[PDB]
Design a protein around this ligand. Structure first.
Ligand SMILES: N#Cc1cccc(C[C@@H](NS(=O)(=O)c2cc(F)c3c(c2)CCNC3)C(=O)N2CCCC2)c1
Ligand SMILES: N#Cc1cccc(C[C@@H](NS(=O)(=O)c2cc(F)c3c(c2)CCNC3)C(=O)N2CCCC2)c1
Ligand SMILES: C[S@@+](CC[C@H](N)C(=O)[O-])C[C@H]1O[C@@H](n2cnc3c(N)ncnc32)[C@H](O)[C@@H]1O
Ligand SMILES: C[S@@+](CC[C@H](N)C(=O)[O-])C[C@H]1O[C@@H](n2cnc3c(N)ncnc32)[C@H](O)[C@@H]1O
Lengths: 245, 245
């Protein structure tokens, strides 16, 4: 039997025997996260996750992976957001993300909640996912800008948003990327991600080695900006040491 | 007459009328730096700079550039380093770099000289060039590691080095990239660059908007490291604020 591995730029992969028609369809197909260990294994149709059970990639022999199911009954399916629906299981967390990050009070004064590393990781490590409702740039630009705290550009056409009430973990915790605060000295970046549950979204990826319990921060893309950002920029600029002539 | 623009990934370009044979050969060819304004204009042979005089790209009309020579008699040619020769005019500075950076005492204690921004720039701006002698990785790895303070990897085969006495500006100042110190909170990165004088080298490019007289720093690529780096890493790690459980 002939196995295909399709790796995404982000390091994740779809792996399985293609059927007679060349489609990734069957009962023993898997998505493997970028750690090359955490997997969602089970029923897929044309590469789409129907019933992916939490599993571990234990070994591979001549391209053929061996998966072992994790204890419990964690199971996932393709559940792309719409403009109006964020998730059909908003409180079901992502298992890869849950091992790597947690939400707590931000270390930045008055900045609400932030996102923190649960464990030590090296540079270029995917930590968290930024999923949300899919809206147009035109819709974001034309509406009240007070509504645009969590609007992250996906591409030239699409913005990913986490609107009220989903910006609270008691209502939405399937992904947690929207909890990372801004810093001008960030330790993470936003990057593209192809997720088996969320579809094409963005992720948070480290820029350096990060120790456990550090806050994860990203430099936000303003280039008008919110007042808190204007204030922090002026303060950052004043803080920088300079050569004196 | 038919003009060709060849842009490099770094934003610089070669521009000129191709000759009957399709080669970038003639007396009116130019290299234009990534600012799309600073240019080296004159005699090129098959895309190679023979006599490039300092000039400004003033305008373009239907692909045809108009250059105006700068005052003075600044002129440059292709002068790729060897394993043993860094430059045939080591003290002739790069004109683009000279407008953007200067060397002074580093703001990092006991870290010698550093590299500083001369002017305010936005993110993703090329500031400085990292040229030097071209040696193999095998040569760098096998020799005394005390000789490897300025060794920057160019590719899988080649390392760029600025050995003694060329690490002093009184002996070498054609490029200044080797003056940028390390930081775990850098404001620049190393990037690839195709230079008309130096050939394929690396550059220093900003990661954020940088104000005038800020020190330019990059996160060095260790991933054994020098003792100063081990010491600074432990100190950086201890300095980071953490969430407390
Ligand atoms: N312009 C703009 C703009 C509008 C809203 C939000 C932002 C910040 C956004 N910058 S963005 O590049 O993703 C962006 C987000 C957007 F919603 C839009 C634009 C750009 C372009 C203009 N149209 C809307 C960012 O980095 N964020 C917000 C969530 C946490 C981090 C920028
Ligand atoms: N390993 C290693 C190594 C050896 C020497 C220097 C460095 C640091 C180098 N890191 S490197 O990725 O460019 C590098 C530079 C190297 F010379 C070598 C390697 C890697 C791989 C091993 N072979 C040699 C760097 O970022 N520098 C030095 C000049 C100022 C910034 C790393
Ligand atoms: C993507 S959310 C980040 C998580 C948010 N702090 C929370 O509690 O849900 C972006 C919002 O966080 C706040 N924020 C992010 N970075 C900040 C910073 N550096 N300083 C102050 N507020 C910040 C602003 O309210 C902004 O609209
Ligand atoms: C590429 S050179 C940088 C310029 C150098 N400081 C000079 O004066 O020429 C690298 C050398 O600078 C020093 N250096 C760079 N960053 C440092 C740092 N953060 N702390 C201490 N020394 C540093 C080390 O001596 C290292 O070998």
């Amino acid at each position: 039997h002939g196995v295909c591995w399709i790796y995404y730029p982000d390091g994740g992969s779809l792996v399985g025997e293609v059927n007679e028609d060349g489609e990734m369809t069957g009962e023993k197909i898997a998505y493997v996260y970028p750690d090359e260990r955490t997997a969602l294994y089970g029923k897929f149709i044309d590469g789409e996750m129907i019933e992916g059970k939490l599993a571990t990639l234990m070994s591979t022999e001549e391209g053929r992976p061996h998966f072992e199911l994790m204890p419990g009954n964690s199971v996932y399916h393709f559940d792309k957001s719409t403009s109006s629906c964020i998730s059909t299981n908003a409180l079901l967390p992502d298992p890869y993300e849950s091992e790597r990050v947690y939400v707590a009070e931000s270390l930045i004064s008055s900045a609400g909640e932030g996102l923190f590393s649960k464990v030590a990781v090296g540079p270029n490590t995917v930590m968290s996912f930024y999923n949300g409702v899919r809206i147009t740039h035109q819709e974001v630009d034309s509406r009240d800008w007070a509504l645009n705290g969590n609007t992250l550009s996906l591409d030239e056409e699409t913005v990913i948003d986490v609107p009220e009430p989903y910006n609270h973990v008691s209502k939405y915790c399937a992904s947690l990327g929207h909890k990372a605060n801004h810093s001008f000295t960030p330790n993470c970046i936003y990057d593209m991600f192809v997720h088996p549950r969320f579809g094409p979204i963005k992720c948070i990826r480290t820029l350096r080695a990060v120790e456990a319990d550090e806050e994860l921060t990203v430099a936000y893309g303003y280039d008008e900006a919110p007042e808190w950002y204007q204030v922090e920029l002026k303060a950052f600029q004043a803080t920088q040491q300079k050569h004196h002539h």
